[PDB]
């Protein structure tokens, strides 16, 4: 009975300078142990936010996270070329740790 | 739930976590993580045991808590409050 994570929007197109929000849903309450990762076209992955809203060292303020219970979201402001990537959420509440399918952002 | 096993013998205190058999066990002492690869080599964690060699009452008394890998210290709800002296012929 592992926790299923879902990101209903598989792909999103936006414009430079815009602000977008990516939704993430858990099948059970994950008590804010929700993290966000950014994967670049070359396959490199970086941590962005952990525990729903804490920014990881080196991550710019344009990234913010929110959510509670089963509903979470990542908000990315002032979009730039460097932000073109796939964003993934992951729950860290119960083993086995699980990830959603990601949202590919094109700008 | 089973109680923590508290073994005080000579100058060594050995605590044994109650449950979670088959799981890696982690520890905190007064809200500080211990049992890993830290500077103090008189503190050892093996299986469900935490060994405190040359135990110091002043620095090592206090709250101890164990939890299985996969769990969070913040969620632990069963603590050991240890106040012990390792005096010769304590009896």
């Amino acid at each position, epitope marked *: 009975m592992d926790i299923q994570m879902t990101q209903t929007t598989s792909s999103l197109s936006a414009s430079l300078g815009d602000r977008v929000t990516i939704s993430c849903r858990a099948s059970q309450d994950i008590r804010n*142990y929700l*993290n966000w*990762y950014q994967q670049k076209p070359d*396959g*490199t*992955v*970086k*941590l962005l936010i*952990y*525990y729903t809203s804490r920014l*990881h060292s080196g991550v710019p303020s344009k990234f913010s996270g929110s959510g509670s219970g089963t509903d979470y979201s990542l908000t990315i402001s002032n979009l730039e070329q460097e932000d073109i990537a*796939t964003y*993934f959420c*992951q729950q*860290g*509440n119960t*083993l*086995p*740790w*699980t*990830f959603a*399918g*990601g949202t590919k952002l094109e700008i | 739930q089973t109680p923590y096993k508290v073994s005080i013998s000579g100058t060594t205190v050995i605590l044994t976590c109650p449950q979670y058999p088959g*799981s*890696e066990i*982690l520890w*905190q002492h007064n809200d500080k*993580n211990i049992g*890993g*690869d830290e500077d103090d080599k008189n503190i050892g*964690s093996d299986e469900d045991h935490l060994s405190l060699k040359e135990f110091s009452e002043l620095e090592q008394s206090g709250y101890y808590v164990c*939890y299985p*890998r*996969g*769990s*969070k*210290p*913040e969620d632990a709800n069963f603590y050991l409050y240890l106040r012990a002296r390792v005096c010769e012929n304590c009896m």
Partner: nanobody
Amino acid sequence: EVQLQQSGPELVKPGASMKISCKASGYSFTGYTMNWVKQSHGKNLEWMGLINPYKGVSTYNQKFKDKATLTVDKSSSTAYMELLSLTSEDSAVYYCARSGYYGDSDWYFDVWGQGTTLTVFS
């Protein structure tokens, strides 16, 4: 700087086994947990398991316990994952990723290797 450097791509036939590696630099190997993550179809991510480098004790996702064997070599700061009884369904990119040593931070991955592509075919 802090980095996880993984071994190169591997091509293997079904039924074979393959051990891939992950070299840590810029930080104390034994002061953090090492995790392995599988990405198939260039999207779907799955946490396979973790290993405590200091103690050499592993904890697996039941889905991959039969498929993987995790080990570490403390002397060289290298983590290994051996993949067993390979099938084409095991073709994917595998990542090693670091997390905290203790439960206060072992559940989010702060440093990721570049990934190792494994392709199983005949």
